Amino acid sequence: PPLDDPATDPFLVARAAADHIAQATGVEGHDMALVLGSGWGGAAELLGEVVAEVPTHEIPGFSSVTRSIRVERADGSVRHALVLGSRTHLYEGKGVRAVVHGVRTAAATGAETLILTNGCGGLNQEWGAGTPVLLSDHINLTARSPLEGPTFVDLTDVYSPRLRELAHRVDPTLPEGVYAQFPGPHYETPAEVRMAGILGADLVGMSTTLEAIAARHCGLEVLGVSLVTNLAAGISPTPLSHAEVIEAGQAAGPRISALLADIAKR
Amino acid sequence: PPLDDPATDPFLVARAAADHIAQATGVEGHDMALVLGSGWGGAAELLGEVVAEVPTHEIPGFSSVTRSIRVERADGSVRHALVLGSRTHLYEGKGVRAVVHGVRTAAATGAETLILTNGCGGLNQEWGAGTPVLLSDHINLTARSPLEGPTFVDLTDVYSPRLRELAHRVDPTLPEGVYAQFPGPHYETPAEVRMAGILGADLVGMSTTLEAIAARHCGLEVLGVSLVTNLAAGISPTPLSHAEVIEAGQAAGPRISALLADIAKR
Amino acid sequence: PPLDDPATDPFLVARAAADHIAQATGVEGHDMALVLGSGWGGAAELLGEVVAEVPTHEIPGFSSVTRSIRVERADGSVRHALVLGSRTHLYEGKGVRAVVHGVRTAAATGAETLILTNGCGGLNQEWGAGTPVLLSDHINLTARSPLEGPTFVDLTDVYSPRLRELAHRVDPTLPEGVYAQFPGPHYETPAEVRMAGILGADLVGMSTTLEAIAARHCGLEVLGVSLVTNLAAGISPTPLSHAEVIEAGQAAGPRISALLADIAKR
Ligand SMILES: Nc1nc2[nH]c(I)nc2c(=O)[nH]1
Ligand SMILES: Nc1nc2[nH]c(I)nc2c(=O)[nH]1
Ligand SMILES: Nc1nc2[nH]c(I)nc2c(=O)[nH]1
Ligand SMILES: [Ca+2]
Fold first, then answer.
1. Which of C188, C192, C211, C247 is catalytic?
2. Where are the domains of chain C?
3. Measured between CB atoms, does C191 come within 8 Å of chain B?
4. Which of B214, B215, B209, B212 is nearest to B196 (CA)?
5. Contacts of B117 (CB under 8 A, 6+ apart)
6. SS3 state at C71
7. What is the nearest CA distance from C182 to chain B, expressed in angstroms?
8. What would be the CATH architecture of the domain defined by A1-266?
9. Measured between alpha carbons, how far is C143 from A183 in angstroms, rounded to an integer?
10. What is the Cα–Cα distance from A3 to A12, expressed in whole angstroms?
11. Measuring CA to CA, how many Å separate A249 from each of A46, A117, A255, C177?
12. Chains adjacent to C (≥3 CB pairs closer than 8 angstroms)
């Protein structure tokens, strides 16, 4: 049944998603899932040997290619990473269920670990375009929640200290920040960015927190990595050019992809 | 007509609601109404003589028991209190009309006083779990409103000085606070809690302000009382276990039940 | 097709609107457009010669009178100002598309400059009721966006410095401030007002920013002018009576329409 239909149980569709993915991939269960956001598009190429590719629109609940990858750890053991193909934003109007469907499907496949990445604007002048920042916490400014009902979930540690420790083994220099989510799709005015800051955020973007609350609700351990696309409006006196931003964004691709693939082995 | 349809006038449903109530109870008009939040389930047991109980889902506009209670005052005269059953939340996804329908039903019965109570997280460390707090003002962070048109209504004193005066005669030690309504149902993150602080809140919860605005627009005097369920996330260095919370919550039962009962007689 | 039909292209409907206007008015294109807000009702009477009046409920996508005005310039040339009739608020529940249809219809007629006016409450005590204020930036607190897709648009200078400079050649005494948009229609509680102050706003109201973001997306140069209806709740020690507000409101009429006429010539 259609995820859009309020009578529909969202987890029942995630269930059917998971069961399709297992049949189409020959992988009974996965161990971790990655949501590659703006800028990480090739961040999974060094994850490992692709085991299966599933036309994403073919999976229950969805509507480009979801990948199943054998991650090989140093001791030789293997994990199975589910790389979600698409991504649906809150701004698309498709409902919060559609925004978090990837996450709940990740869950149903048994992937206890979730890696959420995104592109965003930075409020700390110390982190320029290209800088990856670990999420230490978040501020959901969407006035939305992906949970329906008396689902009183606790968010005291949405972003697992365990996982950031493992990220800091791969690169002890990665800074940490509080990520704030705006509904988007438009960008923030300088007065809005000052606001984000006053409220305590170090980063601003238009995704991830709904996904994160959803995942914690499913009992997942969540790693959150932002790739600062460029300083937020009004932060730097000398704003980068749009071409400069896109340029600083491509430059990061190899580093960023090296990062994920390494963290994923642990 | 069903409240869910934009065509329906929510007030006409309220009217049907109050007419059902006067018929079923034999009480032609109530004088005051009480909404019992989390932790107040038994706060109306010393209120007075229960004259009638109406299964809530039987009153037009709803869908668990609504009560008419006689309040015997000092001077020997009576007052009838309507104790609204349910309490539909914004997060239930049934619409803002469903949220404030009880308040409009109460207004329709002729109540001129509304007491709203709720359970919330506290940000003042002085107010441990079990602490009742009068609302001196609120901050509605739901980006939603109960009013549907160029209905420009004044909120300069949503929480009546008169009623807080009376409550202080009953118990001059009730502190007062500014309450913030988040849409929920998830709880706030340590960063969002600090944020509520930064914005000027002393308390965070998932209800009440929509109801209060609805009420003032209907001309009622509002008294808001919160019951700190437990310090908000990240507030206390030392979290209280669930046993401590549920425990501090039950110990407060006798006090708030006596509080309302006294307040109702005035 | 109807605008609230998600499959409908909001821009096709703007186009259809621009075409109706062109034939109904005889003017092939407009150069600028004005949105008359609360208190600006007669602010376009001195603009110039009314070349045509089109009942609004008659232009595609709408549902009082939309005006086509010839503006005579210093060098003798002329410009055409499309003065939008109506004005649909976010609160009416019609959808964000109907809120910014006016703007999109203006752009489609070829207008390049847009003057957004509104009445609002003020947080600065030096700007009492009747004071016109220019917007230097805004804070959109509605959790909504007029944009429906990966439409990533830069909002670093929503309110054109160019125009604000012209605004100041006309009247060098106009102060500037940051505008906060609440979804409304209920007004703000004293704490919500302090909140807006802490967040960086000098003015609070129920419109403008979604339109502005919409204009900026269409490539329009935006000039935003508020008229302080009166001080925000809890700001002034001695609040004005509603009689004093409406009065201060009308006494500003001639200055306000002189202002727009002079600005319209440039
Ligand atoms: N809101 C918001 N979203 C973003 N997404 C990206 I990539 N960069 C930004 C940014 O600066 N602000
Ligand atoms: N938002 C919110 N609602 C609550 N309800 C209760 I009981 N405790 C809380 C809390 O800490 N936050
Ligand atoms: N939100 C808001 N809108 C307004 N519109 C006008 I006229 N005055 C106000 C005000 O004080 N607050
Ligand atoms: Ca597993």
1. C188
2. 1-266
3. yes
4. B209
5. B34, B35, B36, B37, B39, B40, B43, B224, B225, B226, B227, B256, B260
6. strand
7. 7
8. 3-Layer(aba) Sandwich (3.40)
9. 6
10. 9
11. 18, 14, 11, 35
12. A, B
Q: Which of A9, A90, A156 to mutate to test the interface with B (most CBs of B within 10 A)?
A: A156
User: Do the Cβ atoms of A7 and A221 come closer than 8 Å?
Assistant: no
User: Is the Cβ atom of A231 under 6 angstroms away from ligand 1?
Assistant: no
Name the amino acid, one letter, at A203. L
d(CA A43, CA A259): 8
Integer distance in angstroms from the first to the last C-alpha of chain A?
Answer: 38
Q: Which two tokens stand for residue A89?
A: 């934003």
Q: What ranges in chain B are assigned the alpha helix state H?
A: 10-25, 96-99, 101-109, 161-170, 190-198, 209-217, 242-251, 253-265
Residue C131 phi/psi, 5-degree rounding, is -80, 125
For ligand 1, say whether the CB of A232 is within 6 Å of any of its atoms.
yes
Q: Name the experiment that determined this structure.
A: X-ray
Resolution of the determined structure in angstroms stands at: 2.4
Token pair in block for residue B3? 């409240």
Name residue, tokens 């410009």. C79
Q: How many CA atoms lie within 13 A of A98 on its CB side?
A: 18
CA dist., res. A6 & res. B93, Å (int): 9
Q: What are phi and psi of C45, to 5 degrees?
A: -70, -20
Annotated binding site of A for phosphate: 38, 87-89, 207
Residue C89 touches partner B, C-beta closer than 8 Å = yes
Q: Which of C63, C116, C64, C90 is nearest to C185 (CA)?
A: C90
